[model samples]
Target: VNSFSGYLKLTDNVYIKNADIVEEAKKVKPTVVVNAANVYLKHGGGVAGALNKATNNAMQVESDDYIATNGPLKVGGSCVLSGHNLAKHCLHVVGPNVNKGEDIQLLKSAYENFNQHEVLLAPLLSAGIFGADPIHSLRVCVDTVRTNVYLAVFDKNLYDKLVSSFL
Candidate 1:
């Protein structure tokens, strides 16, 4: 469970740039690479954003089992959800803020799905908004998930037990 703390460059030339990220990812030989974005635009979005769109579109085009979504589909901001249809599993969660109860419900749903043997993954909430802290948001998100839930984040400070109880 590798984690990264930063924003992807979502720009007009992103698709080409993303080939590089994809190439790098393949070299790392990860079982699966979860590419996350704050939003999806049909055109004029950055390289990272376009890459996310292209990956989902390609998966959908190539297979019968695929899911796609935009943020309003959840309670918070806009998000896009897509994955291979016949794959083990995928989950998407998004919200305006981690404090929302709806966010907890989404986490629980994701946990349940994973418990049932789904290969679940999601982008950190608030991935691109200005001043949003991914580490803090992840702490809150993980706490809301069930006890059996296991997640990894880039922030080592996130491991404290007090943070888990407070959120």
Candidate 2:
């Protein structure tokens, strides 16, 4: 699992993975998980979609309510919730749909916006329907967390590239 060529520790507390993001995240039993989403609050695509369904649409229900009160989540904006989720907490951030600024900023913000966690599952951001640059998105995830971060991934080719890119 951690043996992928570039799948070693990136920082003292940052690590990478090459298995299915959600499944592997389940294995570690993270205190919480930080995932990405769209402003519409529809967790219907990419990593967000998978995790959304994982929560049996509870993520969507809460997210919908949050949006109703606060308006659509702007890029870089985030909200936290937990209920019928796989972890104790779920940090949902609206990723770049436009100018992908120092993409790490949003992730860093997502980590800070939440109340707490020891180990967080960081997904490959915007790589799905968002058409994001997976590599840079990963770097963003790497530089954000204050506690231990396990970046779960799902592709072997991408996995190979990830290990090689950072190695």
Report the number of the highest-TM-score candidate.
2
Our model 1 lands, by Cα RMSD against the true structure, at: 10.9
Runs in model 2 deviating more than 4 A are: 1-7, 98-117
Q: Local error of candidate 1 at 32, Å? A: 9.4
Measured with C-alpha atoms, the lDDT of residue 42 in candidate 1 is: 27
Q: lDDT by residue for model 2 over 93-157, one digit each (tens)?
A: 77665344435446445445432566667676666556666777766666665666677777778
Model 1 poorest 10 in a row by lDDT? 9-18
Clashing pairs in 1: 10-46, 11-45, 11-46, 11-47, 14-47, 65-85, 66-85, 71-78, 71-79, 76-96
Q: Residue 45 error for model 1, in Å?
A: 5.7
User: Which residues of candidate 1, in runs, are more than 4 Å off?
Assistant: 1-51, 54-56, 59-72, 76-82, 85-87, 97-119, 147-167
The CA lDDT of each predicted structure is 0.33, 0.68
User: Tens-digit lDDT track for model 1 on 1-167?
Assistant: 33322323222111111123333342333333333322222222332343345465653342222223222233332222343331222233333334332343343333233233222233344433312455454554454433222232333353343234333
Which residue pairs of candidate 2 clash? 6-163
TM-score of each: 0.37, 0.78
Deviation in Å, model 1, residue 148 alpha carbon: 6.6
| lDDT agreement of model 2 with the native | 0.68
